[PDB]
């Protein structure tokens, strides 16, 4: 049994390191997807920006 | 075909916010007006009051 633990110490390390790094990798991932998508739609947004002071959509009078 | 019915619902939500801000207006306006027209009959009727 204690050969039987120091090889599974060795081994549980090694799986510790390979699954943070895995999931790290995964993260990064879906962030890079992300930014694909935002790169694509800030082609999108007209020329000179967006008027941010006033509403985009005007649905009323204002008498 | 899906499309279609999305933005039906849609533009019938704005139509909604449309009129309802055109309606809450004019039912404003109409309130302040009768007020307005109160205090004035109120005004004429401090000036005809009698006592002390």
Same mark, same amino acid.
């Given at each position: 049994?204690?050969?039987?633990?120091?090889?599974?110490?060795?081994?549980?390390?090694?799986?510790?390191?390979?699954?943070?790094?895995?999931?790290?990798?995964?993260?990064?991932?879906?962030?890079?997807?992300?930014?694909?998508?935002?790169?694509?739609?800030?082609?999108?947004? %007209?020329?000179?920006?967006?008027?941010?002071?006033? %509403?985009?959509?005007?649905?009323? %009078?204002?008498? | 075909?899906?499309?279609?019915?999305?933005?039906?619902?849609?533009?019938?939500?704005?139509?909604?916010?449309?009129?309802?801000?055109?309606?809450?207006?004019?039912?404003?306006?109409?309130?302040?007006?009768?007020?307005?027209?109160?205090?004035?009959?109120?005004?004429?009727?401090?000036?005809?009051?009698?006592?002390?």
């Amino acid at each position: 049994q204690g050969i039987k633990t120091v090889y599974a110490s060795c081994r549980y390390r090694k799986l510790n390191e390979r699954e943070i790094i895995s999931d790290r990798y995964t993260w990064l991932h879906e962030r890079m997807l992300e930014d694909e998508v935002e790169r694509v739609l800030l082609e999108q947004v %007209p020329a000179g920006g967006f008027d941010k002071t006033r %509403p985009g959509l005007l649905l009323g %009078p204002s008498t | 075909n899906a499309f279609s019915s999305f933005d039906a619902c849609r533009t019938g939500l704005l139509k909604q916010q449309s009129a309802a801000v055109e309606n809450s207006l004019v039912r404003q306006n109409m309130a302040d007006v009768r007020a307005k027209a109160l205090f004035e009959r109120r005004a004429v009727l401090l000036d005809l009051v009698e006592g002390k």
